[model samples]
Target: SLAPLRVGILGFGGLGQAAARLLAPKQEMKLVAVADRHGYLYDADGIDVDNAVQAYTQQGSVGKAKKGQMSEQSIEDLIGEGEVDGYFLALPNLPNTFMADVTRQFIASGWQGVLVDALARTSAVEQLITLREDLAQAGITYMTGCGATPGLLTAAAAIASQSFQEIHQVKITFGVGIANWEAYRATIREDIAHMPGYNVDKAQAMTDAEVAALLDQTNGILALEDMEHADDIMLELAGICHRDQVTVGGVVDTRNPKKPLSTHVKITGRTFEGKISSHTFTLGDETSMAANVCGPAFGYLKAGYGLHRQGLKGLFTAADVMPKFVR
Candidate 1:
């Protein structure tokens, strides 16, 4: 049997920690390194997920935890070490160009490996598309938008479109429920960026108090509709449909653990017989946002690793390829 893939997780926030827990039980991928804004922890033998999470929670940063090291350039330092086969970039794309900037750093670091991200914005993925050639030259296989809406649902739309002769529309609606907003601070911030009169910069600049006040105004719920999500361009790139034919929106309840509504995608099209129909795929409410996002992120990371081993290096989207399950 082949050796397991050595995996590293960047950005040890809620998503990052969730990715770690998800990896703990998987035999195909071994979690070796994790990084946060303040520090990082690396162990070639694999890390203890429970210990890492506890350290991050109590110490304010993983670097201060046992076997962790403090570093101002945690991500860059981790890449420079080059100890893992691939990485799940659980970092937030706050500035819209953040993911693209991280990709550039990977290119410049001369680290040859697979990188995967659960990015949400259309503009962020667009920026990565512009660097496809650069990523290829750097021997990096990058997968973007590997999260729930732009990922699992987007891939479903691609497969569902095969039954249709002409695609009409693809609508993605998601419902996220989190008990506390602080657990997913970056994610909540990203969601706020989709709100009316709010942009990425504005959301990123908001303090904890400001965010709390806004949530109070909305009764701890963020209702987003027809927001700019990457699923549009991803589906468009896969020849599934036009970008305008796709729409993504969702409701996030920051104060509750139960989903506000079931997450689903609707694909409408016309068949060769001139019959119009629709396909609907729904996600179980039991699956938290972390599960949906990190699960597919790692799956795509596995797929990207396969491509990288085959000497295929470049940028890929969730809609562009199917993910390999991590058994």
Candidate 2:
């Protein structure tokens, strides 16, 4: 296992490239190859990543003309050729679907190492757990997913959520710092809005004007439906916080604390006073894929940068791997 950390990127998209680019240059690692659904490129002499990245951005992916050992190939093809060890795996949503089987196939084919991440969200949780078991049974240690959601930040927030006299509830909020509301407003145009029936009753009870707004909508009833579902889930998770005595909102009672529970786009507002406390929601890209992989985490770097900075190698989650000090 002293093979100088040969790193291969899987998706070659933003998140994949971020992890690869972060590791390229100078560490116990080498950015050996990049791959995606469109195509893949290989390099045994190491890769000239600058050009590859330029092409990736301009093309919305790392495609032809990115500059490397270009070929009309599948990721399985590259893994077969032994062009590299481990792929960064940043495939887009649908393609991320095949990660588990593909990961197993790569391991079976004799690849030295492996790392897979994508669709690492809650919807993919069931599959990911299966994938984790499959990969582990095959002897792979370098893997991360459900990486952010219930991983580091949530764990920290969950702990930080404590220290009160008694438990009340548990809630998770996403996208809190947005100011103009333009992002969500745009959703109205894109036909992705959903008005929650559960909340609609409350909304109607409080303000029929909001209900009027929905009824008045010209089209995209499904989008409104989705928004409502999102809202209901948020409210339910809020109820968990209520039961946990952490708060009176965002509750998803699995009847256990260690089970998986996630709520997105949850806004925190106190019913006691209209003055309100801070609203909470997902952190957009900051706490998401881009930030988790390339943002300011401390591990696996160029030629030798982070070698002396931490313990263990390969990918890592800060709040998990990092030691906590209480004094």
Candidate 3:
């Protein structure tokens, strides 16, 4: 029997912790390490998920937790160790180029393993695309946009496009909700970056008070339209549809735990029979944003790991490959 895959999570924020919790009960994948901005924890045997979460929640860092080590360059330090089969990058793509920069670090470290991310922006994924050759040369398999809209929904659209002779449009609509914004501060800030008149820098510069006031003005909800999501580019690169044919928008309720609406994807295209049809695939409302995001992120990580083991390297988007279910 094959041993369980060793997994490391970068960025122990809400998504990272959620990924840890999701992997805790799984036997196919073992959570061995986790890194946050202040520090990282690594145990080849396995990490104590509960303790790591508690330390992060109470002490604001996971460094002092079991087998934890403090470092300003937690990600780089973790990469230097060269442990684990793959890493899930739950880090925020602030400044747009953050994810790409981290990819460069992985390449520079000469770490040969699978890397997966829940990155959201088109520009961020594009930056990674530019380094495809470098990634392949470094023996790294990088999976980008393995999150809700650009991940699961994008893959759905790709599968649905098979029923069409000519693709017309792909629409991704999402409804996310959280009891409090503090839990997903980085995520909320990234969403805010999609708002009109709000660039990434502007959104990143906003204080908690400023964000709260903005949420108040919007009645604790952010209604986004025509977001520059990575799903567009992913589908386009897969030859499923043109980038202009894809549209992504969503409503996020920061004050409630219940989703505003069911998240789904709609693919419209003309069949070979010369008939126009649309396929709608919706996610259950019971799944929170974290489940939809982190679940697929790890799933794709597993698939990417498989590809890496086969000597396949460089970039692969959600649309280009099917995610393997974790047992």
Sum up the clashes in candidate 2. 46
Tell me the tens digit of each residue's lDDT in model 3 across 225-283: 99999999999999998899999999999899999999989999999999999999999
lDDT (Cα, tens digit) per residue for candidate 1, span 1-327: 169999999888889999998999888899989999899999887898888888899987788777898998898997877479999988888778888888888899988989999888888888999999999999999988998877888998999999999999999999999998998998899888888889889999999999999999988999999999999999988888999999999999999999999999999999999999999999999999999999999999999998998999998998988899998
TM-scores of all candidate predictions against the true structure: 0.98, 0.52, 0.98
TM-score of 2: 0.52
Q: lDDT for model 1, on a 0 to 1 scale?
A: 0.90
Q: Of 1 and 3, which scores higher on lDDT?
A: 3
Off by over 4 Å in 1: none
Tens-place lDDT digits, model 2, residues 98-177: 55565556657654444534333333333444554445455454344323333334334434333333323334432222
How many residue pairs clash (N, CA or C atoms closer than 3 angstroms) in each of the candidate models, in the order given?
A: 0, 46, 0
Superposed Cα deviation of residue 116, candidate 2 (Å): 4.0
> How far off is model 3, as Cα RMSD?
1.0
Better of 1 and 2 by lDDT: 1
